[PDB]
Design a protein around this nucleic acid. Structure first.
Ligand SMILES: [Cl-]
Ligand SMILES: [Cl-]
Ligand SMILES: [K+]
Ligand SMILES: [K+]
Ligand SMILES: [Mn+2]
Ligand SMILES: [Mn+2]
Ligand SMILES: [Mn+2]
Ligand SMILES: [Mn+2]
Ligand SMILES: [Mn+2]
Ligand SMILES: [Mn+2]
Ligand SMILES: [Mn+2]
Ligand SMILES: [Mn+2]
Ligand SMILES: [Mn+2]
Ligand SMILES: [Mn+2]
Ligand SMILES: [Mn+2]
Ligand SMILES: [Mn+2]
Ligand SMILES: [Mn+2]
Ligand SMILES: [Mn+2]
Ligand SMILES: [Mn+2]
Ligand SMILES: [Mn+2]
Ligand SMILES: [Mn+2]
Ligand SMILES: [Mn+2]
Ligand SMILES: [Mn+2]
Ligand SMILES: [Mn+2]
Ligand SMILES: [Mn+2]
Ligand SMILES: [Mn+2]
Ligand SMILES: [Mn+2]
Ligand SMILES: [Mn+2]
Ligand SMILES: [Mn+2]
Ligand SMILES: [Mn+2]
Ligand SMILES: [Mn+2]
Ligand SMILES: [Mn+2]
Ligand SMILES: [Mn+2]
Lengths: 87, 97, 103, 97, 79, 98, 105, 96
DNA sequence: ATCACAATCCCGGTGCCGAGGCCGCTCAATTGGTCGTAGACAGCTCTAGCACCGCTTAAACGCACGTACGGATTCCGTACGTGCGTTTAAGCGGTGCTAGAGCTGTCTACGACCAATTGAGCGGCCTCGGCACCGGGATTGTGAT
DNA sequence: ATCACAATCCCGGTGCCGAGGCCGCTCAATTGGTCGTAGACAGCTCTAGCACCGCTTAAACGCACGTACGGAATCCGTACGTGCGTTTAAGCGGTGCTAGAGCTGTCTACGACCAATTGAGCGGCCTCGGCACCGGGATTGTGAT
């Protein structure tokens, strides 16, 4: 019964510099100009697949809140097990 | 000689084959693949349903666990149809008690 | 038989047994094996549908493991489902990379 | 005044970010993105903040890992510069497509 | 010397089904090592299964179970 | 005489082997290799004939698919010829190799 | 020796491990040795990784194992690296590794 | 109020660590990783044991299933040591 | 293009074995009945997820500029494929020989299930030593000369 | 060669707060007894794994020959790195609000379990049409002119 603002174009919050940093820690020294939009597209496919399961577990449990454990179990579902967040 | 019993879904695969393709048959090898396929998919849904129950601290695997299992497992369009046939058969079953 | 009451070719009796025998949980609901048997029958339908078309395309009346492979690997979603599976005697899809073709 | 040659600051930054473990994507941007993608699956969802840290920790690690495979794809092609097509090669071979 | 029983023309046929047009000379020995490693990993696990069943004969099921373990599920042998 | 340009029979064989499903390794050499590798794990062992068939079906499926990836790695390097380095890149990526 | 841990000479809780094996639908029945074997293995691997991460902690001049010491630990050990090859250890970073061709000549 | 009991392997992990580095500490997150590690490997071994029993038509999970679970699951040297450390415990347990 | 010659495709005949159907027995599914307990639901608590605002400042952005990188081009050597003939062991159908897989039927050592006993492990509470954070000063490496 | 100097590294100082210890209450583990069935251990049955054997090919092999491919070498244009000034919003921490997570208690619908019953599903048997194999023209590309 009150407004959420509307969320649009949030992919672009994954800026050029931020992607460069992740690239550095992956050991990349030179980055083509087209890599940024390509990286956003991959992050989004990744986030969609995982968030789709987290939510599937979350709806099963009849909750309105997504828990670390829904995410943790979704991660493990996809063969991307994560330590440090329960489980 | 004598015997030695081994169950398979062969008869039911045939029965379904007849629904979808009345005028076509199946080799033994292909039949063994279908068998593998059903077992595998059975195990996969059942395992997921098992985990769902444990995650939620429940002693029971109900159709709701099979349903969620199907949605974690199956890809989009394949799940949609699967949920339908599932819910459908459950309805028809309880209304025939 | 619970198959007929539910409308299924696939055995609901068997499937309820395998669920309890398989250490999935303490208890198994009544609808669970009906739901599951239906999904199994449906996916069986979907494969055999597409496998049969492949047998027809390849001028055959009997389905062999190749028809099942063509069915699966041409279907996007099925190929995904069985992405880590090997259909014995299946072969591959004919697909030559462009740069390899003569000009 | 002074000017480092191309690659000098890049090399420096590779060694800097390989020493640390801090998340490299700013936290608000990333969370807005999370709530937006999740909103498009289901409306009125809340997140435990550690559910957002969990996805971010997994996400950043998926993308360092990938930027490694990508980098070896560049180098295979006798290049120093990673491209969209290196990323695509890596994801295809991973069976991610 | 048994490994060499996986011949050049045999590796070539596999490569062809994989869509390969042209094959370096060093590929043949490279594919022998790769295939050895694959078989080692699978047969090791298959035998662990036979062991546990207290048998002297490795069954198709032991192999099927091992393939599955390794993320290489195989249909048509007892799945 | 008569001679096809280099690459023409290569392509004829691709079309051919991508058309069929029969095994491409000779059965007995493979069999003898399976027994050899297994000995080094446990001595005095029998194999079901179907167990060797299962190992051959799987092994070859593995090699065909690896050759597919190796080929892409070659093409990525503007080449037409597969080389050990393409296989090693494939596996590295598959996460088999480190 | 009242605890099943003492009787086994373990630091890990055999009782709790027996509980979990039962409340887990692994099989109808769980043998008396199972929790014992398992609790010891769990203990063996635990000590194996803590060994290596206290070392990391110490190379790094620290009294405390933080998650990066575990990652350093795991990813430098061939065998631990593989056991955890599809695991992501929150907040542990990566190993320093710059590719050769990227080095200035 | 007075918060819900949340079980942990924390106490054991601190024990093992005191044996092996008696002057070394451990942070929250580190222990959280240690704790997931222990659960992860617990599940993996238990899971493989369950399958072994099921495959052999046994109703029971014995140390012999765990043992084989460990051999399929652990890499080489890690397995060798865990097996001897497991058998030792069963042996020490069985007599006392 | 327009030519001939490979290798491939496809078509109607021919035998051969497994798909597929019936058959009758039997074991797993079904029905009808008891008992207890999982969890659906309702009611209550208080955690933590959310919104929102002002302030500081570090990070993001965009623009200027030029180095070194990618790609386009030539160009040379041999590592490849193609196609002969000679060399070999895979494949098949054969008979013979038995390890060991696999099924039954006995029975007892082992684990489920239980109540009553109690001490390990939990959260609550508290505090100080480890380390994050900063500024200084020494070192080190890259780029100007 | 030599020499700034920017950035990084290594050093105690300093202050905030979470690791880790003390406590005492509680719930999950231990204790000892019943009771039932899984499975080990033995005894028998015969399946499939295995061994040596000898012809008939097709597949492996080794070689002659030469081309197209890989790689080394150079050359040009601009894309992508670096640095700077300006612009933007993340993060912080401080406040105020309630949705809904998560926990309790009550009662019953649902599923486990057993005894009895019955036909669906099994192997054993049989036979015949779908399809593998093949030879002899229909057609399609490949290389050469
Ligand atoms: Cl149900
Ligand atoms: Cl035991
Ligand atoms: K809350
Ligand atoms: K046998
Ligand atoms: Mn939206
Ligand atoms: Mn015809
Ligand atoms: Mn039949
Ligand atoms: Mn009948
Ligand atoms: Mn309850
Ligand atoms: Mn260049
Ligand atoms: Mn034979
Ligand atoms: Mn014998
Ligand atoms: Mn025996
Ligand atoms: Mn006994
Ligand atoms: Mn006992
Ligand atoms: Mn025992
Ligand atoms: Mn505590
Ligand atoms: Mn400073
Ligand atoms: Mn300073
Ligand atoms: Mn200091
Ligand atoms: Mn604490
Ligand atoms: Mn203290
Ligand atoms: Mn005390
Ligand atoms: Mn029995
Ligand atoms: Mn070229
Ligand atoms: Mn140019
Ligand atoms: Mn700030
Ligand atoms: Mn805040
Ligand atoms: Mn409310
Ligand atoms: Mn509620
Ligand atoms: Mn009921
Ligand atoms: Mn039959
Ligand atoms: Mn002919």
């Amino acid at each position: 019964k009150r407004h959420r603002k509307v969320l649009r174009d949030n992919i672009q919050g994954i800026t050029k510099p931020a992607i460069r940093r992740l690239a550095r820690r992956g050991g990349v020294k030179r980055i083509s100009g087209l890599i940024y939009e390509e990286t956003r597209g991959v992050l989004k496919v990744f986030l969609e697949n995982v968030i789709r399961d987290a939510v599937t577990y979350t709806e099963h449990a009849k909750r309105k809140t997504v828990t670390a454990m829904d995410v943790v179990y979704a991660l493990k579902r996809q063969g991307r097990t994560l330590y440090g967040f329960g489980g | 000689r004598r015997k030695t019993r081994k169950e398979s879904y062969a008869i039911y695969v045939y029965k379904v084959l007849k629904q979808v393709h009345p005028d076509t048959g199946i080799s033994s090898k292909a039949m063994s693949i279908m068998n593998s396929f059903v077992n595998d998919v059975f195990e996969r849904i059942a395992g997921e349903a098992s985990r769902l129950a444990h995650y939620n601290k429940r002693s029971t695997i109900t159709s709701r666990e099979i349903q969620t299992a199907v949605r974690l497992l199956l890809p989009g369009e394949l799940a949609k149809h699967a949920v339908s046939e599932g819910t459908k058969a459950v309805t028809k079953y309880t209304s025939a008690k | 038989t619970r198959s007929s009451r539910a409308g299924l070719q696939f055995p609901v009796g068997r499937v309820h047994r395998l669920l309890r025998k398989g250490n999935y949980a303490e208890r198994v609901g009544a609808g669970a094996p009906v739901y599951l048997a239906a999904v199994l029958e449906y996916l069986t339908a979907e494969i055999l549908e597409l496998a049969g078309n492949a047998a027809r395309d390849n001028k055959k009346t009997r389905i062999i493991p190749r028809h099942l492979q063509l069915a699966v690997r041409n279907d996007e979603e099925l190929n995904k489902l069985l992405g880590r599976v090997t259909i014995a005697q299946g072969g591959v899809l004919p697909n030559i990379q462009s740069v390899l073709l003569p000009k | 005044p002074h000017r480092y040659r191309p690659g000098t600051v890049a090399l420096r930054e590779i060694r800097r970010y390989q020493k640390s473990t801090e998340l490299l994507i700013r936290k608000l941007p990333f969370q807005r993105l999370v709530r937006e993608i999740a909103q498009d699956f289901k409306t009125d969802l809340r997140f435990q903040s550690s559910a957002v840290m969990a996805l971010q920790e997994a996400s950043e690690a998926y993308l360092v890992a990938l930027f490694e495979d990508t980098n070896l794809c560049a180098i295979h092609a006798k290049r120093v510069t990673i491209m969209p097509k290196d990323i695509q090669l890596a994801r295809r071979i991973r069976g991610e497509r």
